[PDB]
Design a protein around this ligand. Structure first.
Ligand SMILES: [Ca+2]
Ligand SMILES: [Ca+2]
Length: 109
């Protein structure tokens, strides 16, 4: 239910903004998609959509498919881009992103 939280306009814009020349940058992404302006509560609702298996964490598979949370046709991040985002978000080093870490990722964006 991402379009309950973010607009199709912003989602298109956010995904359409990166060329191959651009490093996928979650900071730019979360800004352009509209997530930085959402309440903390809506950021957590975004988190739970991303947490596809509802394990309470965004694990590395789910993280590589992050963009699919916003637009299901979007491609996965590459291994490298996925691990870059995991390095940014995974502050306790357990190899997955919890609720706090996800909010932090958005806050740092
Ligand atoms: Ca999960
Ligand atoms: Ca973690």
């Amino acid at each position: 239910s991402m379009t309950d939280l973010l607009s199709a306009e912003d989602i298109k814009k956010a995904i359409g903004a990166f060329t191959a020349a651009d490093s996928f940058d979650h900071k730019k992404f979360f800004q352009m998609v509209g997530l930085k302006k959402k309440s903390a509560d809506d950021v957590k609702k975004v988190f739970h959509i991303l947490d596809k298996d509802k394990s309470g964490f965004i694990e590395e598979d789910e993280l590589g498919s992050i963009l699919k949370g916003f637009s299901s046709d979007a491609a996965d991040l590459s291994a490298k881009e996925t691990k870059t985002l995991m390095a940014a978000g995974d502050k306790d080093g357990d190899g997955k992103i919890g609720v706090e870490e996800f909010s932090t990722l958005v806050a740092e964006s």
